[PDB]
Design a protein around this nucleic acid. Structure first.
Ligand SMILES: C[NH+](C)c1cc(NC(=O)CNC(C)(C)C)c(O)c2c1C[C@H]1C[C@H]3[C@H]([NH+](C)C)C(O)=C(C(N)=O)C(=O)[C@@]3(O)C(O)=C1C2=O
Ligand SMILES: [Mg+2]
Ligand SMILES: [Mg+2]
Ligand SMILES: [Mg+2]
Ligand SMILES: [Mg+2]
Ligand SMILES: [Mg+2]
Ligand SMILES: [Mg+2]
Ligand SMILES: [Mg+2]
Ligand SMILES: [Mg+2]
Ligand SMILES: [Mg+2]
Ligand SMILES: [Mg+2]
Ligand SMILES: [Mg+2]
Ligand SMILES: [Mg+2]
Ligand SMILES: [Mg+2]
Ligand SMILES: [Mg+2]
Ligand SMILES: [Mg+2]
Ligand SMILES: [Mg+2]
Ligand SMILES: [Mg+2]
Ligand SMILES: [Mg+2]
Ligand SMILES: [Mg+2]
Ligand SMILES: [Mg+2]
Ligand SMILES: [Mg+2]
Ligand SMILES: [Mg+2]
Ligand SMILES: [Mg+2]
Ligand SMILES: [Mg+2]
Ligand SMILES: [Mg+2]
Ligand SMILES: [Mg+2]
Ligand SMILES: [Zn+2]
Lengths: 206, 99, 127, 60, 24, 83
RNA sequence: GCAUGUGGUUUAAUUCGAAGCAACGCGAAGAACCUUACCAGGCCUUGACAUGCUAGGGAACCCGGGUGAAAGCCUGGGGUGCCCCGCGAGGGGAGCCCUAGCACAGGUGCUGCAUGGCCGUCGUCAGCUCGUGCCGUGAGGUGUUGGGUUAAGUCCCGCAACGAGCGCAACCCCCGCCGUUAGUUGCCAGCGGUUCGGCCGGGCACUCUAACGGGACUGCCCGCGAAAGCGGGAGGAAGGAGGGGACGACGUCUGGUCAGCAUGGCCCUUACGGCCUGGGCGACACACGUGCUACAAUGCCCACUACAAAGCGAUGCCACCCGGCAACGGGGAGCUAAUCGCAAAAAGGUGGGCCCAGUUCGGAUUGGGGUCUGCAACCCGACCCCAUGAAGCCGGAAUCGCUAGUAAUCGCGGAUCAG
């Protein structure tokens, strides 16, 4: 356990915070506590929609929950039917002005946490450990990314001896700040236990 | 006359936010003493990188309160509404003084 | 008439004013000694003046804030230093290879985590 | 976090002295910042996702 | 002293005030 | 020690068993779990059982054991030696 | 000597884990109950918690007594909203409430040697590798090696190699110089007034104040050298990366923790689960590991006297005023904080007292007196004043840190938190 999280490095250097407000000492404590309910319910449900990055910008007791997600019509339903069910179930938890939008994950391979998920799924899915990770990466320099890398990391394939694996390609340079890379932590669950997964993608130097 | 106090988190929006404001208090009928950089305040958090025993390895976070302050001399009724039709920055908190 | 210099050194800042006349020094109102008493680096601040022949040629109006009187005295000195190129942009020849035009870029390094005081670490027998 | 022991600190107590905080996110009250209602493990863990606004990574 | 309480610096060290460290 | 600007201290349930058996000129062994309280001169000559962890301990109350708290007469642990 | 961890003992329990450097002021950036997993007692059983199912009663809910160490239990009363049907009494329904039963909850029970993640470490060491080709029947080699150079696999030259990927390095921050936008709550060089206080008019010069840019490249010169580089200098605030930070490569120690959380599995589920008051992690024939103050004359002490940066504070910071030898109490002005406050910076300076003393050194451990926080200071607190004035006259073998604003020495601050 030697290295550092890539996102938490470029905190306003080549990335950005999800929750982007202000707050006082009185408010920040409670105000944030809220976001971690907003992002606990929102997640727990939206899973099989492929949810990515969850913005929560804030004005005077106006919450502004944007949502990037693989599949905008499993957030929606038919017509506008199921998005409403939630848009209030949040104002049910806040007690205020939930503006819960939707924004499609255009290219899905070119956004890490998704990439992480489908793999962690594929491991839950009892697939070919290696090939999962190979094709994982495969598609990433197939959609057109600068760099790719996936790190399967459990008791792998059902083995009693805990190991780890991976592969990659292209530029992976996390010591260049000015290189934008997205981290994806997933976390499969299989009969033998729990097998966290990682995925890093380079898009470009700026 | 009317004084504003911007307290936010970026150095970006907080400069942006206050320079949109600084244009529609010139066109709209007001001389103005410019955008004012103030005594920023730092709240830092030093923490044990490790779950358990490995104490003397530590991480460093700084939350930077950024204070801006612009003065409007000669505030018109051609003005005051031009700045409630300018409001648009997101992580900022604005406040409005007057003596 | 007044010639001024910008004097700065190690969290302390000093302001210098060079009028033609005596050799009295007011540093925050007080005389050069009623502010730099039994302290020896004191009279050293004037050095950048006496390598061109002019202690008694000019007066000294002074102001300082921050640091300790040494770190001020270094800045005071670095103030009379700069102050003389605004009078004679030819005095520059004399007081650079004599070294009096430089910010002592030296600075109280940061205290580090794990280390009692930055560099110093913790003692340990039974190694 | 013994579940019921988040709750012995949630509800208000017999006397006001017993008012010890805890983590909203995990229920370790051992090292908690009454400014995040969070501990040190959490605060990083999260800050490392940029999920706490203005929380930068420090250096000087 | 410094671990000494009834004195100049020994108060200052503890942080305290007493008959031996005034409030001016 | 205890502020004088705020007088002495005793628990109610405990003082209740004292000035009712005082007001009936009788004496019985009391069983209470407070130690946190200051014995007062209107308990002198009472048989009082105080608790340490597991045991109620025999503490008949005489004179000049006045302002001392209860817990001074009820050792909490056991130490005789190491071998 | 005291403070803090730790080994060993002791204990009703002194809850746990850490284990050569890389466990030992480390998990604890705050154990009086709380925290609290521990022990002794009084107890709770769909349970402090979730989404429910079935039978029967109940709106939710709110007030009081009794017994009690508290919990807990027995019990008095106030209350009877919402949805649908209806003229109506009133039945049906959702919620929630109780009693009985069942799903199940919950466990800081185990195994870090079944895992996740995150951390430590060899190590900021210059290393670790792949492609195509070349070479061996092959594992494999070559490349990456040799010579020169570099903080470096940094680079120059050579070579059957040519390049790339993860490292080095740069892009990010801090400090050093300076320019652009800026003049409040900061600033005062000139002029006006001045209750002599930047106090007011006026100004934003400079100091500061944060945002963006500029600048350093072996560029210049003599020398050394195939080159990369190197040595001395000129200019420059900075010179060969200027100082400092974040930044930890493929892998190892089956290193670390099921005690933040996450989870395979073994394990209890009227009991390890739950609530409670009290007791305990602080015990003490010892031993180590870390630090504080000392043993003093380059000093101790009492006055007067200067010069800081950083951070916190409207459930708080508390200028002054009075009382008290004092802690502090009472009264009370300002402050969403460059405007008010913690705030006394301390070593330094001026002046004087001590004159080699177990001492005006030293400040333990005790006797008594008080203040404060707090339901509550006996275990087991901090602070005030008085009296007590211990060991120790610089430390065995062994052993630790630091290469410059560093080492030493002196003060301020923040987090945690009523204290
Ligand atoms: C005693 N041996 C047989 C042992 C056993 C186990 N695990 C089991 O037996 C469990 N096996 C099951 C699956 C339950 C059947 C073990 O799990 C271990 C060990 C060895 C220890 C050694 C440890 C040691 N120090 C700290 C006590 C040490 O010096 C090191 C080291 N290399 O520095 C260790 O690795 C050590 O800490 C360690 O990890 C051990 C074990 O893990
Ligand atoms: Mg220092
Ligand atoms: Mg240490
Ligand atoms: Mg748990
Ligand atoms: Mg508490
Ligand atoms: Mg003394
Ligand atoms: Mg254990
Ligand atoms: Mg306890
Ligand atoms: Mg391990
Ligand atoms: Mg172990
Ligand atoms: Mg092990
Ligand atoms: Mg290096
Ligand atoms: Mg061949
Ligand atoms: Mg080559
Ligand atoms: Mg090699
Ligand atoms: Mg070779
Ligand atoms: Mg290279
Ligand atoms: Mg003004
Ligand atoms: Mg004047
Ligand atoms: Mg680097
Ligand atoms: Mg070991
Ligand atoms: Mg302990
Ligand atoms: Mg008085
Ligand atoms: Mg007071
Ligand atoms: Mg002597
Ligand atoms: Mg060195
Ligand atoms: Mg301190
Ligand atoms: Zn926590």
């Amino acid at each position: 356990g030697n290295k550092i999280h890539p996102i938490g490095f470029r905190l306003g250097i080549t990335r950005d915070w999800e929750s982007r407000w202000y707050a006082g000492k009185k408010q920040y404590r409670h105000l944030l506590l809220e976001d971690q309910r907003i992002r606990g319910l929102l997640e727990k449900e939206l899973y099989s929609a492929g949810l990515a990055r969850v913005d929560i910008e804030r004005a005077a007791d106006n919450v502004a929950v944007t949502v990037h997600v693989a599949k905008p019509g499993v957030v929606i339903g038919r017509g506008g039917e199921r998005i409403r069910v939630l848009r209030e179930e949040l104002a049910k938890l806040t007690g205020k002005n939930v503006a819960l939008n939707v924004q499609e994950v255009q290219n899905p391979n070119l956004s890490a946490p998704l990439v992480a998920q489908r793999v962690a799924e594929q491991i839950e899915r009892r697939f070919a450990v290696r090939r999962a990770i190979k094709q994982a990466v495969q598609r990433v320099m197939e959609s057109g990314a600068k760099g790719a890398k996936v790190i399967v990391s459990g008791r792998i394939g059902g083995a009693e001896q805990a190991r780890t694996e991976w592969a990659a390609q292209g530029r992976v340079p996390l010591h260049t700040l000015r290189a934008n890379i997205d981290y994806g932590f997933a976390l499969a669950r299989t009969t033998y236990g729990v097998l966290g997964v990682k995925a890093y993608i380079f898009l470009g130097e700026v | 006359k009317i004084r504003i106090k911007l307290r936010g988190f970026d150095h970006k929006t907080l400069d942006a936010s206050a320079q949109k404001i600084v244009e529609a208090a010139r066109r709209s009928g007001a001389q103005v003493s410019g955008p004012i950089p103030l005594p920023t305040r730092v709240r830092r958090f030093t923490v044990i990188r490790g779950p358990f025993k490995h104490k003397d390895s530590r991480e460093h976070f700084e939350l930077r309160t950024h204070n801006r302050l612009v003065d409007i001399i000669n505030p018109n009724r051609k003005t005051i509404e031009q700045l409630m039709t300018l409001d648009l920055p997101t992580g900022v908190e604005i406040e409005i003084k007057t003596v | 008439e007044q010639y001024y210099g910008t004097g700065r050194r190690k969290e302390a800042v000093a302001r210098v004013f060079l009028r033609p006349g005596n050799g009295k020094v007011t540093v925050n109102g007080q005389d050069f000694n009623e502010y730099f008493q039994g302290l020896v680096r004191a009279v050293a601040a004037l050095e950048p003046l006496r390598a061109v022949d002019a202690l008694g040629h000019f007066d000294a109006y002074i102001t300082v804030r921050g640091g300790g009187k040494s770190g001020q005295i270094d800045a005071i000195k670095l103030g009379i230093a700069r102050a003389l190129v605004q009078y004679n942009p030819d005095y520059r020849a004399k007081l650079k290879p004599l070294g009096f035009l430089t910010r002592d870029a030296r600075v109280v390094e940061r205290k580090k985590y794990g280390k009692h005081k930055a560099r110093r670490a913790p003692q340990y027998s039974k190694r | 976090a013994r579940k019921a022991l988040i709750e012995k600190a949630k509800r208000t107590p017999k006397f006001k002295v017993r008012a010890y905080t805890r983590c909203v996110r995990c229920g370790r009250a051992r090292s908690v910042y009454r400014f995040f209602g969070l501990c040190r493990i959490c605060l990083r863990e999260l800050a490392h996702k940029g999920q706490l606004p203005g929380v930068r990574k420090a250096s000087w | 002293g410094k671990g000494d309480r009834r004195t100049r610096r020994g108060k200052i060290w503890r942080g305290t005030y007493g008959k031996y460290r005034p409030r001016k | 020690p205890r502020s004088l600007k705020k007088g002495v201290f005793v628990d109610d349930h405990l003082l209740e068993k004292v000035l009712e058996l005082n007001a009936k000129g009788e004496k019985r062994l009391i069983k209470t779990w407070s130690r946190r309280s200051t014995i007062v001169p209107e308990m002198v000559g009472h048989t009082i059982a105080v608790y340490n962890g597991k045991q109620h301990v025999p503490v008949y109350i005489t004179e000049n054991m006045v302002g001392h708290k209860l817990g001074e007469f009820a050792p909490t642990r056991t130490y005789r030696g190491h071998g």
